[PDB]
């Protein structure tokens, strides 16, 4: 369905409709509306910069070069993508989320250096 | 090394800490704080648009096709990347930065036209 309609659907089904949520990320009420608009812009840009430093700018489904550690979650693909929803998954991996982000950043840095060196191999 | 920790460091060493300094770039008192936040957002967006028109969107280390002109700095790669800091370099070539940026835009325009023709050759 429309905005957040796939929230109760499986991860491999909700992931088919990512643009629907993506398009919805953008005196008493004068200053409050202005603060809300600046807050929405700031949160969107922080997410876009965070995707940028990972090398995922301009993509909604971005594959990376960070291997999955079985300590974060040891469930197989038939239990995550076919028998789980995104909210359940967010609860499952919340504690380790920042760790994953750090590794992603580090991975991009190495792949940013290596690619530069190849462009220098005359 | 945290935010700006590499400021006095070697350019070849400071070039590994780009992420730390990129993540930190983003009634009367409410108006003042909103002006500061909107100004920060506009400066970030101008830098991102400037990277975009150069064809460097989503990257921190972007190689280009514009050759370096000895007039800007007749210094060998060791004197820049091994001995100098980014502040000294920024002072050294400030006079020419508005020239350099312009050349970058032109090269990307040519590149885009080139890409367009290849996608049609078929």
């Amino acid at each position, epitope marked *: 369905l429309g905005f957040l309609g796939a929230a109760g659907s499986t991860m491999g089904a909700a992931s088919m409709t990512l643009t629907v949520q993506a398009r919805n990320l953008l005196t008493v009420w004068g200053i409050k509306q202005l603060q809300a608009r600046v807050l929405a812009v700031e949160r969107y840009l922080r997410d876009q910069q965070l995707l940028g430093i990972w090398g995922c700018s301009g993509k909604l489904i971005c594959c990376t070069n960070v291997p999955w550690n079985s300590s974060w979650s040891n469930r197989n693909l038939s239990e995550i993508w076919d028998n789980m929803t995104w909210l359940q998954w967010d609860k499952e991996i919340s504690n380790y989320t920042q760790i994953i982000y750090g590794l992603l950043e580090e991975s991009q840095n*190495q792949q940013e250096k290596n690619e530069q*060196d*190849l462009l*220098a191999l*005359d | 090394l945290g935010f700006l920790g590499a400021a006095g460091s070697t350019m070849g060493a400071a070039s590994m800490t780009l992420t730390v300094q990129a993540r930190n770039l983003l009634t009367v008192w409410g108006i003042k704080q909103l002006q500061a936040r909107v100004l920060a957002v506009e400066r970030y967006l101008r830098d991102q648009q400037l990277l975009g028109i150069w064809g460097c969107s989503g990257k921190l280390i972007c190689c280009t096709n514009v050759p370096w002109n000895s007039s800007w700095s007749n210094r060998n790669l*060791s004197e820049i990347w*091994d001995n100098m800091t980014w502040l000294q370099w920024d002072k050294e070539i400030s006079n020419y930065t508005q020239i350099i940026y312009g050349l970058l835009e032109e090269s990307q325009n040519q590149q885009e036209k080139n890409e367009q023709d290849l996608l049609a050759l078929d």
Partner: antibody
Amino acid sequence: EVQLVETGGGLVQPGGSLKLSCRASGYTFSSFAMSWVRQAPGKGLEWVSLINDRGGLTFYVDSVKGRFTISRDNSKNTLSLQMHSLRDGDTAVYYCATGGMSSALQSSKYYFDFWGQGALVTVS
Amino acid sequence: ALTQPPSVSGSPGQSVTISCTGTSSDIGSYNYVSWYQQHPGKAPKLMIYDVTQRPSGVSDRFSGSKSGNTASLTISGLQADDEADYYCSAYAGRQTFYIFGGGTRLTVL
């Protein structure tokens, strides 16, 4: 007074595997790219493989892409080469060499500078 | 592979040249034609890198040149210490990184 010392066994059966090590001293190990070059007993020098200074990029000759792995550990000043299947045509003296590529922030090399003593790999 | 003569010779006091010929995709396009001197029973050593330069600690006698698709190493003096096999190495771009030629026997009379 740069030193490069290769270690590793010199006698292998056909179809087996062999690990060579190579310790460096006298310079900053992590600042230079490294390579392996081989010389058959009756032939000249033939390049085997190259690895970047940081250890991430590896390059090989066409004949060895699926058989040889080059690696380094900058914290132990060690260059390693793991050879699988190691056919009879690979019998040679294997030399370590410093150089062959740069980090794009350093001047170009495209040459092999310091040369190691060498280790002889004989395929039975 | 690069082509070199099997043998070059001369007496002390004269200069000699060692030729190295390749193709347009290696010798011509890329001006990185290094030369190595291998003493028998020992490991090689660098004598001239790039196409004309020389490392510190190597005598002025060794010099290099390149014209067209032919590179050349010129050795003057011939003090009879250089009883060695000479090799030319050429960068050949990506996927084919370096190509070495056959050894050249330098004999001092």
